Design a protein around this ligand. Structure first.
Ligand SMILES: CCS(=O)(=O)NCc1ccc2c(c1)OCO2
Ligand SMILES: CCS(=O)(=O)NCc1ccc2c(c1)OCO2
Ligand SMILES: CCS(=O)(=O)NCc1ccc2c(c1)OCO2
Ligand SMILES: [Zn+2]
Length: 139
């Protein structure tokens, strides 16, 4: 689990979005595994605006943050899960690291702020759904 809170927006994994997230839907992209809902309380997170390829992510299944090198956001095939069919996920970044399903929503951060959230894993890789292209999150 995990979300990003910026302005009046809550960013979550689309597959973990709650009934209240869907009741307050602003934007969703199935191909990206993202959903943004509206919040009443102001959020304090800053979104990174950069092309960093190094950062730190929170891994709940290890109660640890790991530093990682990650690929630029791209269209990658993701094996079917208990939340998705075997499909092509867009705006996805991969690193070598530990990820289990429950690690989804872990934040990946660089010096500029939030880069993305854990979205995929397995085979010793962790996949992060990029948010740095969603400029509207900061207006
Ligand atoms: C992540 C597990 S969950 O059960 O809390 N949310 C999934 C969900 C399923 C159907 C929905 C919905 C939300 O909102 C509209 O219809
Ligand atoms: C030295 C072994 S490693 O390279 O596999 N450690 C992970 C790592 C990845 C990116 C980093 C970093 C550490 O610190 C700065 O950026
Ligand atoms: C084959 C195992 S599975 O059917 O549960 N889905 C793959 C998976 C593994 C690790 C994850 C993940 C999804 O999302 C975050 O880290
Ligand atoms: Zn950065």
């Amino acid at each position: 689990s995990g979300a990003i809170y910026v302005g009046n927006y809550r960013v979550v994994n689309r597959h973990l979005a709650t009934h209240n997230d869907w009741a307050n839907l602003v934007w969703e992209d199935s191909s990206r595994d993202l959903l943004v809902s509206s919040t009443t309380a102001q959020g304090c997170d800053t979104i990174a605006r950069c092309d960093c390829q190094t950062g730190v992510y929170y891994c709940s299944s290890r109660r640890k943050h790991y530093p990682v090198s990650f690929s630029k956001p791209s269209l990658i095939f993701v094996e079917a899960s208990e939340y998705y069919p075997a499909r092509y996920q867009s705006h996805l970044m991969l690193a070598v690291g530990h990820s289990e399903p429950g690690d989804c929503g872990g934040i990946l951060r660089c010096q500029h702020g939030v880069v993305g959230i854990v979205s995929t894993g397995g085979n010793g890789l962790v996949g992060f759904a990029d948010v740095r292209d969603l400029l509207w999150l900061d207006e």
